[PDB]
Amino acid sequence: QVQLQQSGPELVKPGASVKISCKASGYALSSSWLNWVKQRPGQGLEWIGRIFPGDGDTNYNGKFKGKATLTADKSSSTAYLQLSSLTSVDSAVYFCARGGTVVFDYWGQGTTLTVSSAKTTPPSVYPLAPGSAAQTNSMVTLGCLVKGYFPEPVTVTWNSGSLSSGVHTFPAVLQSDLYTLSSSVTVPSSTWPSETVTCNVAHPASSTKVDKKIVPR
Amino acid sequence: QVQLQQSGPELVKPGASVKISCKASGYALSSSWLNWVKQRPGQGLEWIGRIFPGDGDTNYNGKFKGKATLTADKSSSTAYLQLSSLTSVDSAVYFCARGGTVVFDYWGQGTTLTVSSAKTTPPSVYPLAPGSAAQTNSMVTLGCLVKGYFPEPVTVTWNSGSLSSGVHTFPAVLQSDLYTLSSSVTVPSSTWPSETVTCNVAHPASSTKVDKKIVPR
Amino acid sequence: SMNKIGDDLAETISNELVSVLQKNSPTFLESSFDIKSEVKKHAKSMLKELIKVGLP
Amino acid sequence: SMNKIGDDLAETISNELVSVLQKNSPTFLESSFDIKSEVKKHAKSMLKELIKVGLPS
Amino acid sequence: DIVMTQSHKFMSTSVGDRVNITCKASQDVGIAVAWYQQRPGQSPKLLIYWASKRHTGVHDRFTGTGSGTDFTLTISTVQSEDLADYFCQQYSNSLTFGAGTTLELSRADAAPTVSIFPPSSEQLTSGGASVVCFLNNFYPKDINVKWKIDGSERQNGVLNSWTDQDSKDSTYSMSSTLTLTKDEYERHNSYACEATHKTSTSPIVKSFNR
Amino acid sequence: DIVMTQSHKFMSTSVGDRVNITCKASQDVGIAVAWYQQRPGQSPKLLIYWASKRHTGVHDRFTGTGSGTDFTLTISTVQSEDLADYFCQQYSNSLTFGAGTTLELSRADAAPTVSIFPPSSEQLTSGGASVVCFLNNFYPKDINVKWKIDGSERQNGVLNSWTDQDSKDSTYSMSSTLTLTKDEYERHNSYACEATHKTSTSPIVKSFNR
């Protein structure tokens, strides 16, 4: 069973160092190359470097010579990627991949690296209600603004899942060193403001959860 | 020039032993086989043994394995043949020959081994003359008998070489582990007995030289 | 006897070619047991022909 | 680079084949320098063939 | 120092149909191009390498058609497994990965439903202010949103986010937040969110005032 | 063991003519046969190996042949250099040499001159006795000598010696000594030396009587 087990996600202050491990099975790293690749979240892949565990040879990308260091323990089926002087630009997902020097047969899982000055911070949850104006009144759209939390993720429900159709929850954006979501529902205008609606917003990192009404004021 | 140089002639008593050397030049012994061969007075040619002095591995004939042994000195380009338990049978000329296992592409000059209990001893020189009878009187044939000497060889001349042609000297033969031969001459019948005929033997080993006339009867 | 050394010479040829082949290959080179065996088999035939050029 | 180890292997092959030929030949092998070279050139060309059973897809 | 450009961020297809994914190299890269698939929540996996060789286990539908500065990955028949992201890669001199292409499901045109919301009282007492506009359930993903403050263009202070293609009705949704200070927000009256799209010559405009 | 027999102890030839030196093996020796030349006083040299292949330096004259239990060494043109001894050798499983063939110059038949001599008075005081018979200047070398003591034949106590082909007149000579005790010699009266040769049906015989 070929598998490449990497270490868990890392959340580290800017300027610090991190050592991501990559453990292999189902084949011998002693006769292969192990490569490391950075997929910025949403953007595309950049190569970092590779190592030959058996002969302990390293080839690096010019981009990452000063920042990245590769090493290996031939007897532990394990190689490590060490990254120094971290910034928000190094915040990405890092894979290790088996292969030759340039074509990668089987990739790992991808260890998430997030680099930020922020400490664990609960979101501000602002209700999004319409004004007194009205148009195409068949359906009404509400929302919330999860804002200023760290780290990810955030779970959002409406009426604790009692309102599951016509809902849109959006991936957070990184705004001012913190993450912001928005989410919206669409209920028929018949039952609102008649029937109450609620922002459920859960941030498991801080164990902070919000149950907030949407009001016309 | 390529050549193989062997040690000098040998005299041994029965039961004793010899070491014959064979120095090589013009090629590398550590890349070849050196073979030893017995050539007897009966002209039969027999093979003894070989060595690959680069390794030192040997191979012997079952007839000589008991008493023939080969060693070599790589740093001196020299192979050695050692013979124990000597006897008149082993008395022969011994060649050392370059080649592979079999085909002897180049031969040395040979070492003469004489095995005998005899000590250095002069020949008896006996005059050979016809009896009173008249034998084919156109010519007269006289002779001599160079008998019971050791070692080889002897020199034979007639009237100190003045009686040059029409003479026959024969190679020696073995009587009782001693050497013996005879020689003849054909002077015309009118010359002798009135013109003295003599045979002039010489045995360099014993520094014995014989000057004997041929007398009638 | 002739072929004792032959197979061992093929063994060194076969494994060394594989090591260099692996360390410089742009791809992983899976099933390297089958890579080696073809090379080692081919290597022996090569050795038989190389031996032959030393003719009488 | 690609011939860095191709030559070393041809050299090792040529030397060991010759030493065996000499020790197992009934004929003295003359001009072994020439013998090796034929074996070494033949070794090189066929080493470049052996290496090519790697990935010729 | 070498570019691999995948012209199309997205390619449309239906299940059972034929589709291509293109890649363009800025200079000659021989046949040294590899294609990878990455489904959401998956590490990449190899489809093609050397620009036409199929890797172990990849189904025959993943044809590869490549040399030079122009390469193409063709999927003979598209199915659920193929709704994924695709990257091309050059390794002739150095590693450049392509920009990436996302294979989507085609559906009939759909205009977005647009809503606009003022900043909340709670936010306005903290000194912040966020004007939120949702644009939901539209296709194709080619949408362009413009913000206006008192009828005048606003570019900065705007952060946007999209959902991937909805699994039920194959549409895309977009959220756009314009964030300002309490100081500036209170210095203006009209706020509008204006969407340019292929489903209406007129941009979709919806507005609020104070 | 395997036996290599050279039937002809001697071959007759002349400068400018062809000659075949043959060699018969007792068991199949394949082509594993070598030929050597040996001039008198010299060590052997290789001419042919593998029964038909010339050794480096060997002239076109030396055209060896054969496989099996029969082999040949054809000299196309005989020179003075070739008047030497010739040996064959087999190495199929083990090494065996032949006893050699000796290449002589051919000349017209020649009958020997024969002499007979009694023991000397000096030898007969020491106790021994040697009756001597010379047979000189005959060709070919095939000559047979028998000793008769008072008619009765003699074999034991007889030592023979031979010369090689004389360089002046291409003949051979032989010496035969009948070595007896003084007692044996004195108890007999008539001594005679006989020889059979191609030149005469009647043997050559010469007598001595005390």
Numbering used by the authors:
A (entry chain I), B (entry chain H): 1 to 217
C (entry chain B): 60 to 115
D (entry chain A): 60 to 116
E (entry chain M), F (entry chain L): 1 to 210
Which statements did the authors publish about this structure?
CelTOS is a malaria vaccine antigen that is conserved in Plasmodium and other apicomplexan parasites and plays a role in cell-traversal. CelTOS is a unique multistage Plasmodium antigen that plays a critical cell-traversal role during infection of the human liver and during parasite transmission to the mosquito vector. CelTOS is secreted by Plasmodium parasites and is localized to the surface of sporozoites. CelTOS is proposed to disrupt the plasma membrane of invaded cells, specifically those of the mosquito midgut epithelium and mammalian liver sinusoidal layer, and enables the exit of parasites during cell traversal.
